[PDB]
């Protein structure tokens, strides 16, 4: 019973692909296989934002607080446990560009 046709990794036309340590655990995982999400968040709770934006010395800031950039790479056990990715029915299992 082949489960995935992909077999989980996006790799074709090559023998080998570089291994990446998982953010959460650090387990080595295939770069194709890895659940990778790029995150641009803000360093600060919106309330905290109000508080700081009061005290910003340079008024020449328009959204003058930096965002936090993360390239987040999960091994499978981790990204499942941690709900980044979750179990779906056989038909949905092949759906490719899902979010909102």
């Amino acid at each position: 019973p082949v489960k995935r046709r992909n077999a989980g990794r996006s790799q074709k036309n090559r023998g080998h692909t570089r291994t990446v340590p998982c953010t959460n655990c650090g387990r080595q995982v295939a770069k194709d296989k890895a659940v990778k999400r790029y995150t641009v968040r803000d360093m600060v709770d919106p309330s905290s934002k109000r508080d700081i934006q009061q005290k910003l010395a340079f008024e020449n800031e328009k959204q003058g607080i930096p965002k936090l950039y993360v390239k987040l790479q999960y091994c499978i056990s981790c990204a499942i446990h941690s709900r980044v990715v979750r179990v779906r029915c056989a038909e949905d299992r092949r759906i490719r560009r899902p979010p909102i």
Binding site: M43, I52, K55, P66, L68, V70
Partner: protein
Amino acid sequence: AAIDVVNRCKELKINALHIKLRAKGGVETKQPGPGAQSALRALARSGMKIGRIEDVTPIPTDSTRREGGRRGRRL
């Protein structure tokens, strides 16, 4: 922590701090800890002006090998 710092800058006559934020970085995690936000807030909460803000977290062009196993932390 923050309020102690602020109280002590206040007598050094210091209005404003630039901020350089860091997580352990390098080969370790790049997500700053829980205290990050709280300390940043409590600093300004204490009536301290805030200057330019940068994240300097150590960022390998490339890494030495991670402290985990080959299989990472199990459990």
